[PDB]
Structures are given as C-alpha cells and as structure tokens.
C-alpha cells in the first residue's frame, strides 16, 4: 500500500545518510588522531629535553660537591696505610691512624724511606 512505499524510501534514505555520515566520521577520527599525534610529539620532545637538562644540572652539582670534598680532603691528614684520618705523625707525607698501621707500613716499606729523626 502506502506503507510499503514509505518504508522503502525511508530505508534507502537512511542507508544514504548513514553512508555519508560514516565518511564524516572517518574524517573526524583522522583529524583528531593527527592533532594528538603532533601534540604528543611536541610534549614528548619537550619532556625529553627538560629531563636531559636535569641530567646536565645534576652532573654539575655532583662536580661541585666533589670539588668541595677534594678541598676538605686536602685540608686533612690521612693514614698512609688505611687512608682513615691520621692521629700519629712519623715524617713527611707519612702519618697513621694507629700503631698497627704504622708497624704494618714500617715493615712493608717505610723502614727504607723514613725521613724521621
């Protein structure tokens, strides 16, 4: 009757509209994906470069700290044997933390080179 006609044309109209809008959908998906692609790449390079600059800064902090520890070490006397802080002075560039270290180093080599009295 009339219903067959209406149902026919409505169905075919729905198929055509769907067909067009899925092309719209494909285009919108592609656009969004390209936008986030470029965006995520920019954010990425940004973060990587900030992290590497963080590395550089840390390297320099460590260098400075190391320098100050070198200075502190230079301003102290150390046992020639175990490299702990010295408490006994024998002679030039030759001090010890303990009598144990003194005799160890003595019988090891220092007999032959001692510049003491």
């Amino acid at each position: 009757d009339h219903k067959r006609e209406t149902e026919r044309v409505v169905r075919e109209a729905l198929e055509k509209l769907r067909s067009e809008m899925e092309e719209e959908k494909r285009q919108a998906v592609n656009k969004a994906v390209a936008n986030m692609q470029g965006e995520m790449d920019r954010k990425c390079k940004q973060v990587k470069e900030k992290c590497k600059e963080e590395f550089v800064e840390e390297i320099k902090k460590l260098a400075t700290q190391h320098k100050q520890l070198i200075s502190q070490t230079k301003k102290k006397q150390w046992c020639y044997n175990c490299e702990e802080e010295a408490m006994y002075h024998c002679c030039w560039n030759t001090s010890y933390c303990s009598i144990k270290c003194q005799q160890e180093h003595w019988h090891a080599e220092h007999k032959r080179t001692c510049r003491r009295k």
Binding site: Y88, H89, Y96, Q102, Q103
Partner: peptide
C-alpha cells in the same frame, strides 16, 4: 728502630 710515635691532635 721503628720510631715510637706519640699522638698529634
């Protein structure tokens, strides 16, 4: 002959 050492401080 190893010298007897005294503490510095």
């Amino acid at each position: 002959s190893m010298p007897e050492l005294s503490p510095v401080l």
